[PDB]
């Protein structure tokens, strides 16, 4: 049994700029940062003025305690680097070229031309 409330609370104010309410776009980033994913349906059923307490309940229900980054790699798999970097850029990632190089040194130390997405889900789980 493992309490995440402090981490949820810290993340909320990181994305809301310390306010007790959070904008919808920033809420999507928040829940995505703990590996949470919603269809457009559950998305459109959210409240319109999401506050801290709402987030803490939502996180409790949706956070994958056993596999937080299930959606990066599920244990229920390897991609070329330049393919990966292209896909990131294709999907309009807000990461700078530095952020990506740092992620790549971390996840692919040996500068192999392949990247393990299991590895990425591991290292991210470590930084939580």
């Amino acid at each position: 049994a493992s309490d995440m409330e402090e981490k949820f609370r810290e993340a909320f104010i990181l994305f809301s700029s310390c306010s007790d309410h959070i904008e919808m776009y920033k809420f999507f980033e928040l829940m995505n940062s703990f590996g949470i994913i919603l269809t457009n349906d559950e998305k459109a059923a959210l409240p319109n003025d999401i506050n801290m307490d709402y987030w803490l309940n939502f996180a409790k229900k949706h956070y994958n305690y056993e596999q937080p980054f299930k959606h990066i790699n599920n244990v229920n798999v390897q991609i070329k680097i330049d393919n990966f970097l292209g896909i990131m850029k294709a999907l309009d990632t807000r990461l700078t070229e530095s952020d990506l190089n740092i992620l790549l040194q971390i996840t692919n130390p040996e500068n192999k031309s392949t990247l393990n997405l299991k590895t990425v889900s591991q290292k991210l789980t470590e930084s939580i």
């Binding site: 609370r9 810290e10 104010i13 700029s17 310390c18 306010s19 007790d20």
Partner: protein, 131 residues
């Protein structure tokens, strides 16, 4: 210097004073110690200080570089439209989340003692506490 030596004798025991009480004096004398300073003097002399170390400790706690410009840095970081203001809740969450976090009651009390208004001029909030 008498203040110093007076406050020591209130809370001295076996000729040494605890780090917690030694910090209490430092506050009483108008100094503002943090956990960093409390840890620097833990490394040196343990948890009980003789008079001379207590003095050396009070030296650590002067922090003359303390000005409004230095203190407001974290509030400024969360002031995106640069208004000079943050809500009470914004500053409550900062004071109770990171650093030598206060309790919620301590933060609320410190903000409600500075203004009855929900938006707070943090340059002025920091200047107030610095005196």
């Amino acid at each position: 210097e008498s203040d110093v030596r007076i406050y020591f004798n209130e809370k001295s025991s076996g000729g040494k004073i605890s780090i917690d009480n030694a910090s209490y004096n430092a506050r009483k004398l108008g100094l503002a110690p943090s956990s960093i300073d409390e840890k620097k003097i833990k490394e040196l002399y343990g948890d009980n200080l003789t008079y001379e170390q207590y003095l050396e400790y009070l030296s650590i706690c002067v922090h003359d570089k303390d000005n409004v410009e230095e203190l407001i840095k974290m509030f400024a970081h969360f002031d995106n439209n640069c208004t000079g203001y943050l809500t009470k809740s914004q500053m409550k969450n900062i004071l109770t989340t990171w650093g030598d976090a206060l309790t919620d009651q301590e933060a609320i009390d410190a903000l409600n003692a500075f203004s009855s208004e929900d938006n707070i001029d943090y340059k002025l909030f920091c200047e107030d506490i610095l005196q």
